Amino acid sequence: QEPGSGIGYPYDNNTLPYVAPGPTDSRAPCPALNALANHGYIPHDGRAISRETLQNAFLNHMGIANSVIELALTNAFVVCEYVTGSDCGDSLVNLTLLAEPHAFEHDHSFSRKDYKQGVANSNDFIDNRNFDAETFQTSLDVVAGKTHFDYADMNEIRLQRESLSNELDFPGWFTESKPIQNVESGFIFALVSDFNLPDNDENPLVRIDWWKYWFTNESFPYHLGWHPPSPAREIEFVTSASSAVLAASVTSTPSSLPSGAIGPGAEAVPLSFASTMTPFLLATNAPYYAQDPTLGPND
Ligand code: HEM
Ligand SMILES: *[C@@H]1O[C@H](CO)[C@@H](O[C@@H]2O[C@H](CO)[C@@H](O)[C@H](O)[C@H]2NC(C)=O)[C@H](O)[C@H]1NC(C)=O
Ligand SMILES: *[C@H]1O[C@H](CO)[C@@H](O)[C@H](O)[C@@H]1O[C@H]1O[C@H](CO)[C@@H](O)[C@H](O)[C@@H]1O
Ligand SMILES: *[C@@H]1O[C@H](CO)[C@@H](O)[C@H](O)[C@H]1NC(C)=O
Ligand SMILES: *[C@@H]1O[C@H](CO)[C@@H](O)[C@H](O)[C@H]1NC(C)=O
Ligand SMILES: *[C@H]1O[C@H](CO)[C@@H](O)[C@H](O)[C@@H]1O
Ligand SMILES: *[C@H]1O[C@H](CO)[C@@H](O)[C@H](O)[C@@H]1O
Ligand SMILES: *[C@H]1O[C@H](CO)[C@@H](O)[C@H](O)[C@@H]1O
Ligand SMILES: *[C@H]1O[C@H](CO)[C@@H](O)[C@H](O)[C@@H]1O
Ligand SMILES: *[C@H]1O[C@H](CO)[C@@H](O)[C@H](O)[C@@H]1O
Ligand SMILES: *[C@H]1O[C@H](CO)[C@@H](O)[C@H](O)[C@@H]1O
Ligand SMILES: *[C@H]1O[C@H](CO)[C@@H](O)[C@H](O)[C@@H]1O
Ligand SMILES: *[C@H]1O[C@H](CO)[C@@H](O)[C@H](O)[C@@H]1O
Ligand SMILES: *[C@H]1O[C@H](CO)[C@@H](O)[C@H](O)[C@@H]1O
Ligand SMILES: *[C@H]1O[C@H](CO)[C@@H](O)[C@H](O)[C@@H]1O
Ligand SMILES: *[C@H]1O[C@H](CO)[C@@H](O)[C@H](O)[C@@H]1O
Ligand SMILES: *[C@H]1O[C@H](CO)[C@@H](O)[C@H](O)[C@@H]1O
Ligand SMILES: [Mn+2]
Numbered sequence: 001q002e003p004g005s006g007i008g009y010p011y012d013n014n015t016l017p018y019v020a021p022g023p024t025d026s027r028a029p030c031p032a033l034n035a036l037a038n039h040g041y042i043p044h045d046g047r048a049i050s051r052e053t054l055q056n057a058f059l060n061h062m063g064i065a066n067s068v069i070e071l072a073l074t075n076a077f078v079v080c081e082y083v084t085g086s087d088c089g090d091s092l093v094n095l096t097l098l099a100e101p102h103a104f105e106h107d108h109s110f111s112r113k114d115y116k117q118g119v120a121n122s123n124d125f126i127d128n129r130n131f132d133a134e135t136f137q138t139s140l141d142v143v144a145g146k147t148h149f150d151y152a153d154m155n156e157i158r159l160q161r162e163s164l165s166n167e168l169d170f171p172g173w174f175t176e177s178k179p180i181q182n183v184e185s186g187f188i189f190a191l192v193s194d195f196n197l198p199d200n201d202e203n204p205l206v207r208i209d210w211w212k213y214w215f216t217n218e219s220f221p222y223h224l225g226w227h228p229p230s231p232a233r234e235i236e237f238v239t240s241a242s243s244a245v246l247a248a249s250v251t252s253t254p255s256s257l258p259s260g261a262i263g264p265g266a267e268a269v270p271l272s273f274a275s276t277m278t279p280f281l282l283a284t285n286a287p288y289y290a291q292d293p294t295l296g297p298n299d
Contacts, residue, residue, distance in 0.1 A: 001015045001016075001017055001018070001222065001297065001298040001299075002015070002017045002297050002298055003015055003016065005298055007222045007298060008061075008222065008227070008228070011063065011227040011228045011230055012060065012061055012227070012228055014060070015039075015061070016039045016040045016041065017039065017297030017298065018038050018039060018219045018295050018296070018297055018298070018299055019038060019039075019040065019044060019297070020038070020289040020290075020294065020295065021034075021037070021038065021044070021046070021287035021288075021289055022287075023286045023287075024045070025037075025044065025045050025046055025287050026045060026046030026047055026094035026095045026096045026287070027046055027095050027096065027129070027130070027218075027287035027288065028046070028095035028096070028098045028099065028129070029098055029099040029105045029109070029112055029128065029129045030095075030098065031111065031131070031214055031215050031218055032058075032062065032064075032187070032191070033046075033095055033098070034095075034131075034218040034287075035062075035214065035218045035219055035220060036054075036057045036058070036061065036062070037095060038218050038219055038289075039061070039219070039220075041056075041057035041060075041061045042054060042057050046094055046095035046096065046287075047093065047094045047095075048091045048092070048093070048094075049091065049092040049094075049095070050090050050091060050092075051073050051077075051090055054069065054073060054076075054092075055069065055073075059232055061228065062191065062220075062228055063191075063227075063228030063229035063230055063231075063232045063233060064190065064191070064229075064232060064233055065231075065232040065233060065234045065235070067234045067235035067236075068187075068190065068233060068234060068235050068238055070235070071183075071268055071269075071270065072183075074270050075104045075270060075271045076092055076098060076104065077092065078104075078270060078271045078272065078273070079097065079098060079100055079103050079104045079271065080092055080093055080097060082100065082103065082273040082277070082279055083097040083100050083279045083282070084097065096129065096282060097282060099128055099129035099282060099283060100279055100280060100282065101114075101115035101125075101128055101280050102115075102175055102280070103271060103273070103279075104180070104271060105128060105129075106175070106177030106180050106181060107165050107169065107173070107174050107175050107176070107177060108158070108161040108162045108164075108165040108166075108174075108176070108177065108181065109128075109135070109161070109181075110135075110136065110139045110157065110158075110161060110184075110215075111131055111132060111135055111136035111139065111215050112128055112129065112130070112131070112132055112135060113126055113127065113128055113132050113135055114126075114128055114165050114168070114169050114173065114174070115128040115173070115280065115283075116169050116170035116173040117165065117168050117169050117170075118168050118169075118170075119170050122170060122172075124170075125280070125281065125283065126283065127283045127285045128283060129282075129283050129285065130283075130285055130287065130288035131215060131216065131218065131288045133216070136212075136215055136216070138160065138161065138164055139157050139160070139161060140208070140212065141160075142156050142157045142160050143157065143208060146208060147207065147208055147209070148194060148205040148206060148207055148208065149205065149206050149208065150203070150204075150205055150206075150248075151189075151241070151244040151245050151247075151248045152248035152249060152250075152251070153206075154185050154188070154189075154206070154245045154248070155245045155246065155248040155250060156250070156251075156252060158178075158181055158182065158185065158245070159250065159253070159254050159257065159261060159262070160254055162176060162254070162257055162258060162261055163254035163255060163256050163257055166256050166257065166258055167256045174258065176258045176260075176261065178246065178261075178265035178266070179265050179266045179267065179268040179269075180268060182242040182245055182246055182265050183238065183239070183242055183268050185241065185242055185245045186237070186238035186239060186240070186241035186242035186245070187238060188206055188211060189204045189206060189237075189238075189241040190229065190233040190237055190238050190241065191214070191229070191233075192206055192207055192210040192211050192214060192221070192226065193205055193206050193207070194206070194207045194210075195229060196225070201237070204241065207224075207226075209221070209224050210224055210226050213226075216290060217290045217295055217299065218288070218289070218290065219290075219295055219299055223299065239267075242265070243264070243265075246263065246264050246265045247264065250262055
């Protein structure tokens with residue numbers, strides 16, 4: 001928000017306003033990076049981004065500690081090298097390349113379509129990067145009529161998304177990605193679980209309105225009473241939430257689940273790509289921004 005507004009105080013004492021991305025700006029498949037870039041905590045154009053820039057932005061403006069993004073930074077830079085064909089050093093070329101499919105970006109996202117979702121021909125591809133309201137609604141629908149949800153509910157959401165994706169993607173495309181998605185599950189609990197409940201750290205419940213605001217608007221739900229977690233969330237919370245989601249008992253099993261969908265997931269590890277492998281073409285669509293309604297500087 002505008003620095004003088006005090007909307008982040010006393011959790012964030014140095015806020016910057018929301019500014020919608022322009023048609024030439026680079027945005028990511030990540031609602032967190034997009035919110036940061038929309039506020040200029042990382043470059044508004046989404047280009048040439050250092051590790052320390054990302055670390056400071058997450059820590060000071062989202063209450064996410066360095067430990068949480070250590071692997072994410074490693075993978076971002078592996079993907080940058082893979083896509084561009086050369087070492088990216090400590091300057092991530094842009095956010096858009098992070099939507100390289102079957103890499104860091106993965107199938108069965110909560111709020112994005114798959115790279116080959118619903119395509120009539122094997123060579124087609126679509127926008128697997130920008131926020132997709134319909135896709136997100138498929139996640140929200142699992143928890144319809146609720147204000148909060150728990151680990152078991154999250155497990156049902158990711159299962160619904162795996163089911164839909166496996167049914168709708170071009171035959172042969174769908175590839176399950178439990179370890180990456182469920183880090184991101186942990187991330188959701190880390191950012192938008194309800195810290196105003198007495199047992200948040202041990203039994204966190206996501207506030208659905210907070211989640212919806214963050215994903216739809218790619219800005220921070222201050223107007224709904226959200227603030228950056230304090231103290232900043234650490235990696236242990238995230239991987240614990242991740243394991244807890246996948247350990248949760250399934251009481252409604254979707255059809256067309258990939259094999260082994262139900263049960264624990266592997267620990268996330270650094271990505272690696274064979275030097276002979278040419279990257280898939282990136283979707284070229286202009287960055288998404290909220291239009292219903294459009295956001296002001298303090299939203
Ligand atoms: C340097 C740090 C980060 C990088 C490079 C990164 C990168 C990515 C990428 C490539 C995806 C696309 C995966 C897919 O859904 O197909 C993604 C998704 C996502 N990211 Fe980030 N991320 C970072 C940090 C964070 C943090 C700290 C949070 C929250 C605390 C977060 C929240 C999410 C969520 C919830 C998704 C899933 C979106 C969906 O499934 O619709 N990210 N991230
Ligand atoms: C983000 O960077 C990527 C990587 O350089 C860009 O994707 C490449 O764009 C060039 C044209 O500038 C093409 O020749 C390549 O084919 C693209 N690579 C792939 C794998 O598709 C991308 O255009 C950049 N996006 C933004 C918005 O800046
Ligand atoms: C991105 O741009 C490519 C080259 O300009 C097109 O070949 C792709 O189909 C893709 O087009 C989509 O996104 C752009 C945004 O730049 C629109 O201009 C297109 O109409 C389309 O939505
Ligand atoms: C914001 O400023 C207040 C007042 O000086 C201070 O007490 C608080 O610790 C600050 N918050 C942060 C995160 O630095
Ligand atoms: C997006 O932000 C606007 C402005 O604060 C708000 O009115 C709207 O409800 C938000 N959208 C969601 C889905 O939370
Ligand atoms: C989540 O999982 C990691 C290992 O994957 C642990 O190091 C952490 O303490 C938490 O249990
Ligand atoms: C790991 O940490 C998470 C979040 O604090 C808990 O929910 C889980 O039960 C385990 O202790
Ligand atoms: C990972 O950690 C979770 C959260 O404590 C457990 O529920 C699970 O069994 C796994 O060990
Ligand atoms: C885990 O436990 C649930 C109830 O919480 C059952 O419905 C399910 O069959 C599984 O055993
Ligand atoms: C069984 O119970 C779980 C617990 O959260 C739900 O997620 C599911 O929809 C079913 O009712
Ligand atoms: C139980 O819930 C799952 C996930 O929402 C559905 O796929 C199923 O149809 C049932 O309603
Ligand atoms: C749906 O079915 C799966 C396996 O068929 C169970 O693991 C789950 O508990 C639910 O009953
Ligand atoms: C289907 O395939 C997977 C292999 O990843 C197994 O986990 C599962 O037991 C089933 O055979
Ligand atoms: C989240 O983290 C847990 C613990 O490392 C994994 O088991 C899960 O697959 C996801 O990566
Ligand atoms: C990571 O691992 C892959 C295996 O595919 C190698 O190709 C790559 O060079 C890196 O060592
Ligand atoms: C990258 O480019 C090579 C050759 O140009 C393709 O064969 C490959 O599948 C990928 O698209
Ligand atoms: C988005 O743009 C519209 C222009 O109609 C405004 O109404 C709104 O306040 C926001 O700036
Ligand atoms: Mn995806």
